[PDB]
Amino acid sequence: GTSKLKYVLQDARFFLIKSNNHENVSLAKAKGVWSTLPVNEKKLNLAFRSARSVILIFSVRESGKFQGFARLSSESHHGGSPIHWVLPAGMSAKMLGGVFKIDWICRRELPFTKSAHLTNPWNEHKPVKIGRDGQEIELECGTQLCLLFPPDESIDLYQVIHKM
């Protein structure tokens, strides 16, 4: 069912993560990590101290879908094992901030066609699929969007709850 999920999402904060390629989301799903540019890193560290759960919702551009969502389990840190992100043209790994540890809650995809009824008050009430990398999603919109995903029966939320 969906009860433990609703418990994890209670009073959470939600951020949209836009990636240019599937490889970076695959690395994030395998390694339980994400790294963002410093502008977003500062927002996510502030958010992590501010709320009981901070949720990242991932979408690969041109895919027409979200690829899943995850919960920050740490503030960002530096000096860990290198991660071979696939960067946009002209970019270098040094442009990134630190690395956040994340616990995946759903590794399943959700097509944008299923979230067309959801708009984000923090982005001019544009459909929730629309937003820059790092756009915050308001609480109610973010909760309903997460509840739309197919349940990921491979994940035990008992473990996630046991870090809140």
Ligand X SMILES: Cc1[nH]c(=O)nc(-c2ccccc2)c1[N+](=O)[O-]
Q: Report the binding-site residues for RNA.
A: 18-20, 34-35, 85, 133
Q: Does 100 bind ligand X (CB under 6 A)?
A: no
Binding part of the chain for ligand X, among 82-90, 104-112, 115-123, 140-148 by CB under 6 A, reads: 82-90
Beta bridge partners of 114: none
Would you give the DSSP letter of residue 17?
E
Q: Which is nearer to ligand X, 9 or 99 (CB)?
A: 99
Compute the least distance from the CB of residue 97 to ligand X, in Å: 8
Q: Does 104 bind ligand X (CB under 6 A)?
A: no
Q: Does 135 bind ligand X (CB under 6 A)?
A: no
Compute the least distance from the CB of residue 15 to ligand X, in Å: 11
Instruction: Count Cβ atoms below 10 Å from residue 156 Cβ, excluding itself.
Output: 10
**Nearest Cα to Cα of residue 65 among 113, 3, 97:** 113
**Nearest Cα to Cα of residue 105 among 30, 156, 145:** 156
What are φ and ψ of residue 154, in 5° steps?
-80, -10
C-alpha triplet 140, 142, 148: angle, nearest 5°: 105
Q: Which is nearer to ligand X, 5 or 56 (CB)?
A: 56
Of positions 8, 9, 15, 36, contacts ligand X by CB under 6 A:
36
Q: Which is nearer to ligand X, 43 or 108 (CB)?
A: 43
SS3 152: coil
CB contact at 8 A, 76 and 100 = yes
- List residues near ligand X by CB under 6 A: 20, 24, 35-37, 40, 85, 87-88, 91, 95-96, 133
